[PDB]
Amino acid sequence: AIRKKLVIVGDGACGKTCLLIVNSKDQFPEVYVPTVFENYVADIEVDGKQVELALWDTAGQEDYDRLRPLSYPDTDVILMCFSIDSPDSLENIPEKWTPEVKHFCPNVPIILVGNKKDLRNDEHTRRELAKMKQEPVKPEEGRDMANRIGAFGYMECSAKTKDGVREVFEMATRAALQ
């Protein structure tokens, strides 16, 4: 069996921990607490291959910028996340996450991931974003961004409805195997 290390990063509260737990445990956490550092393991099957995925959870807050790179050594694939309901977090993808990840993880494949897919047409969400002349990220913006930053690929998912959660981790696994 093949062992690959995945690290997940992105703005605070954009759903990294739910994404990881729903894939590994098929369960959806309810506690509202920010992650500092955690580890999970998920087993995955792609293209007839058997992979043990080490999932490294991190903090999205700038406050942990000095500590976060402790997670980066020997990474085989990156999940770089933003939230569909937050245009600000997409903005921070080329401005903050891409430079940090390309610097500590050069030559490591990056899967750009738009989280919380269930919210793109959710009514309370669009109401709130419209208050600030914003709207949910459109797939196009997400896909475009993945090209700007040179991601291995673009996936959207919703951890809560599990929509796409699976495909995220096969893309990531296939990225890692090469």
Next chain:
Amino acid sequence: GHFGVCVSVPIVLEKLLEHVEMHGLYTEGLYRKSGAANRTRELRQALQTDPAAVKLENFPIHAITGVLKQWLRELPEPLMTFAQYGDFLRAVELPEKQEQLAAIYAVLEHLPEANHNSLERLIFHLVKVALLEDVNRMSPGALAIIFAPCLLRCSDPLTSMKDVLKITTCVEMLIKEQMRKYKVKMEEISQL
């Protein structure tokens, strides 16, 4: 500046705090979510130009919180001091609740009063945030996680992770102790 200078309470701090108290306490994930980097950067630049002439209503609330935490992290020496760092850590290493608490408050009277001024204002702020946990979802614990690296700094940074959890416990206990002492003071006011 304005920013990254030696620390009643600095007007930039107060201005930022008072606006968030007036406007932000119902925002889900206050201090947990970050602002847009560029909008945050512009707000920081503005508060170097004309600190009082800044209409904060023109900025997003997570940019405003972003700049607040950026201010704390850019202080020459952290709010809680370099000197007392080791003593806060040990206060936390004590075996049971009430003496950890008693030690932490014992460390606090050792602070230079300018640090003590800004720090107590900030802790009061965080109390107000947590009292409204039912709306904004921020527990004392969540706030401690976020603010602990802002308030105290060692450098390894290997087992700085082990240390970060302790300064988190320290700040979490301050928030909680101030919060219950709030509950009791409100009670005592109606008494005798």
